[PDB]
Design a protein around this ligand. Structure first.
Ligand SMILES: Nc1ncnc2c([C@@H]3O[C@H](COP(=O)(O)O)[C@@H](O)[C@H]3O)n[nH]c12
Ligand SMILES: Nc1ncnc2c([C@@H]3O[C@H](COP(=O)(O)O)[C@@H](O)[C@H]3O)n[nH]c12
Ligand SMILES: Nc1ncnc2c([C@@H]3O[C@H](COP(=O)(O)O)[C@@H](O)[C@H]3O)n[nH]c12
Lengths: 443, 443, 444
């Protein structure tokens, strides 16, 4: 069975089950009719199952590639959802295993039923539905159908945007003004015929395009009230645009959003936000490129102990560095005056200043250069879900030197230019630094 | 007071006290005569004291330099030992503060007496000596006279080498064969009139030079029997040679040697040794460039908690990388097949294999690429003492894939070439990644 | 089946499999030929299996013996390797269970194949070998064939000595000069016709005997360069000599060496080395007999938590004490002036002095008397592997009293040797129940 064939059968089996489930739900709601146990046990409401086998024999397999590899011979399977949404991804991944290892692809109904909430009111019916309907050999991919549907639903909820509009290159900010600037620059790019950017999905619903009646409707103020972490997508025909998510504040929220965004398998996400500068030689407006993180955020301690080192992705580091040279003033070694590369402390205690003594030893021990509340969490999540990551913050205050609580446009530009550099980079973006011993074949 | 003047007064006060102490000791040994309390209380056996003051006013001070900087106005002092041995260092450091800040230098006797053992019997004398003789602002430097004398004495003991022969660029190895190769290459370089290398200090005493009668006396086999960590110095006229220390095995020993070597203020130390490859795609003989460390060595947990991130020094990382391209085969992106960049696990349990299950979770969580017993320790110590560091290991076995327990020359060459690249690098070697908030002015 | 019979069948089955494996390896290397799955599944490359059963019925079994006992009825099994090397041991152990409990012995092929590396080319073969060949009830013994072969190979590597030269009485030292003194005394004993010592296996290869051409070749200086922990064996006809291992420095190394030496089932191992004296009344050259250890070595925390008490073996303690009286002058309570019995601190931080304050509280809390870097580790390992242990250190410095870093070396080593003698004559009184676990394997 081939890639194109596998995709088509997945679409078929999936479409069939969702329709069969929607059908049964309608029947129950109108005539209190229930589905037959036999049909269900036969895959009536089941997710498609994708299996890929490898015999182990191959001339010279990709020993250096970061993804799309086999660590051993055997069968790798996974339930699948929304094949259309994941068409590109699934195609590309299956193609790599097909052409580089001559793997045996096969599709068939799984043993897992689709929870009815994902195929769609009242509350009395809620009692019956949950009673008679579905509610809530190595891994071929990181997440299974259940986990993916779970996160897609949630993404829309926190983002106020359809998941089909998310681009592979993500930018995260903890400062509102950045989206204003992003949207402005975005609309501007859409009007330029030479720019690949043809649309702008906005949190709330707005869909700005070149044929739009007064693109002022871009930023809906009501967006921040109904969505915890509003997103904005600058789309391109080939889906290689830029997504910007205003994550808000705190490690808790940073963890939450990454938990979901991870299922879309981004190519990279960068943290472009504010931070407090801890060094006297630092000036408000300066940049900090994190080369390491002092994880005082707690939120991920249980799944990733604080002593597990979270490294820097060299490719992303150069990108941020180079992009900073270009956009910010003249290049050379002069950047040093405006850019500091060092360790960033991420805390879950905004008011850490009320306890400086207790913190001072840590800052000193870590040679801390800046402090924020999202960096380490985003980076750690990137690391956990094999999503290249990077952090370039901008000093907005100097807590330790009597300057507690513009460069916005420039800062955002550095982020965007970095994206550009990484996009052209092609596959050099992905390395083996994030690969696990039991790494799934799919990227 | 000027740099040259300060150095001269330091030499004087120091020379005087050591002679005065040596004198008093001889008098006691021969005639049981004791020193007079008044003279001592007047600085008879005291170390010289170096004080540097800064008013705070200066046009535009070095805001980007890694060392020789003032974080605030005030006086910085420190006791000093062996001014001749530290002549270059002290001169350079004082010149920087003198010319860039117009700092006020001053020398005077301290309140600290030189422990008699450092200026050099039955149980009867030792009893008297320790009874009647000395026994064992902001800081201007990292270590004080007592701490420095303590380490110099120890360095000679573990190394079997005079401290005056140590060079600024250090190489560490946990494999004996590396010194054989190093000495061979070393003697070879001494015979070449175009090579800056003019001498080779050897563990045990040997001093090979171009005018030597059969330089076969180089490696004294008795060296490993009388010295725990034998060193070899390839010296140059300007003292910019290469020092190689065979550290032996274990985190304990790695910690010990660095504790002392740190007082000589090296420019950099690289770990060039063996390790176990943890990945199936790794082949014996491949190289591992550490970008992070999983500190399971324990030995430094109390002074530097395992959650404090130990970063990579970019400059050292590139030098190790480039040096690997040059020396090892052809350049390009092909290095990837021979070189893996990733996280190294340093353990204090050589037989960790006897407990794979317990370890496996850690290896996986850290994306471990290799495992040794000294790396993280050496790097952590470098970090602690502000000594740029780096690690480039060579896979000598594959514990997880059966194969358990020429390239040596190549490996060593990579280390040496890296040193060369860093030496030419000049000051770009030192960055601010290791600076503390209360960083002493002296490098 | 009887002891002698079991030994013979073990030798047979083992010899057969090793030869069968060596054969298959040769075939692959020369003709790329692979073994047949059926033969292997039939015990072609398999280790012998030793099983001992007990019905539970017996007049009056040894209720006080430290080893060779049954806690309950049932079958006890274990894979076995190098039956020749372990002939004495295996025979003695099987004899005890046979005659004291009338146990049912039986030998047969196991389900475990011998990893090819233990029966010993190039690099392009390593890939194939590891692909087509074997790579790297209740237990009858502490270690199985896999674990034993693993350690034997390693012992030779760290020691620079063939495993069959190791004696039951082991001495550990962290000071080079002790081997010089040991070898000297050793050669001397070999020349004396009244001494049971007939040979001296040396690290590196040398095999000194009475018929040797200038026994100066004893200590090969190159030994410390090619072997991390050089050993020296003073052998006797009945293999009851003394083995000396120069372990070097650190808890890591102390742990490593004991991990391997334990499979040879020593009768005892003593730590005879230097330490720092922490008491003002202590004089350089004094002795310290450890009655307890403050484990600040870390290296064994995971498998043996620091709060599990590591006790002193009374028999070993008396031997060390008496030996000290004899060798170090006259007996009586006059030893007190030269010998202090107390708690020893074992750390993995040689430069602990750089943090005295942080340590002071601990030293004080434990009534610490000395500090070193190997004792607690050696002792803990002995405890873990049921190998009687003891520590008698010699103060080489006084870190806390201005005396920071030999005739006494010879005396110290003599105390160690005399202690061994006392323990050797002690017979079985050496082994007690203080090290027995609830699920203790029948074999010593
Ligand atoms: N001195 C400081 N301490 C902690 N967090 C921050 C920040 C960042 O700014 C945000 C905090 O916002 P407020 O400064 O409005 O409380 C956080 O998302 C955090 O990443 N800037 N300066 C900081
Ligand atoms: N699989 C492994 N596990 C732990 N350490 C090592 C080493 C290294 O090898 C040395 C240990 O030597 P041996 O392999 O001779 O015991 C240590 O210095 C350590 O850094 N190589 N392979 C290793
Ligand atoms: N004051 C002290 N602190 C720690 N270890 C030791 C030792 C022992 O001496 C050895 C250390 O050697 P060096 O004293 O040459 O560094 C270790 O094996 C250790 O057991 N002697 N004195 C010591």
């Amino acid at each position: 069975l081939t890639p194109a064939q596998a995709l088509d059968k997945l679409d078929a089996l999936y479409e069939q089950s969702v329709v069969a489930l929607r059908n049964a739900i309608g029947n129950y709601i109108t005539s209190g009719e229930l589905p037959d146990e036999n049909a269900r046990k036969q895959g009536l409401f089941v997710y498609p199952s994708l299996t890929v086998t490898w015999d182990g024999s191959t001339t010279n397999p990709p020993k250096t590639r970061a993804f799309g590899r086999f660590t051993h011979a055997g069968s790798y399977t996974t339930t699948i959802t929304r094949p259309t949404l994941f068409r590109s991804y699934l195609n590309e991944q299956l193609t790599l295993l097909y052409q580089d290892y001559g793997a045996h692809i096969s599709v068939q109904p799984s043993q897992h039923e689709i929870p009815y909430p994902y195929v769609i009111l009242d509350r009395s019916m809620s009692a019956g539905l949950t009673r008679y309907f579905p509610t809530t050999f190595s891994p071929l991919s990181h997440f299974d159908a259940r986990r993916v549907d779970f996160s897609l639903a949630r993404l829309r909820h926190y983002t106020g945007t359809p998941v089909e509009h998310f681009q592979p290159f993500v930018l995260f900010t903890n400062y509102t003004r950045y989206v204003d600037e992003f949207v402005r620059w975005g609309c501007s790019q859409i009007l330029d015929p030479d720019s690949p950017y043809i649309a702008l999905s906005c949190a709330g619903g707005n869909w700005i395009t070149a044929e739009t009646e007064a693109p002022e409707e871009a930023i809906s103020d009501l967006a921040w009230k109904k969505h915890q972490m509003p997103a904005w997508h600058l789309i391109t025909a080939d889906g290689q645009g830029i997504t910007l998510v205003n994550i808000g504040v705190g490690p808790s929220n940073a963890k939450t959003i990454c938990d979901h965004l991870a299922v879309l398998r981004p190519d990279v996400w960068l943290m472009i936000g504010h931070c407090g500068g801890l060094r006297e030689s630092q000036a408000i407006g300066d940049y900090v490129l994190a080369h390491a993180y002092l994880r005082d955020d707690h939120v991920l301690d249980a799944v990733l102990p604080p002593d597990i080192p979270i490294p820097s992705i060299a490719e992303v580091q150069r990108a941020l560095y180079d992009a900073t040279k270009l956009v910010s003033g003249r290049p050379g070694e002069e950047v040093k005056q405006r850019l500091r590369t060092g360790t960033v402390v991420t805390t879950d205690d905004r008011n850490w200043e009320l306890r400086y003594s207790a913190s001072a030893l840590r800052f000193n021990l870590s040679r801390a250069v800046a402090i924020d509340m999202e960096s380490a969490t985003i980076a750690a999540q990137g690391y956990r879900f094999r999503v290249p990551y990077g952090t370039l913050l901008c000093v907005s205050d100097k807590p330790l030197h009597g300057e507690i609580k513009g460069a916005i446009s420039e800062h955002l530009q550095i982020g965007i230019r970095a994206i550009d550099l990484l996009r052209a980079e092609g596959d050099r973006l992905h390395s083996r630094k994030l690969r696990t011993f039991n790494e799934p074949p799919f990227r």
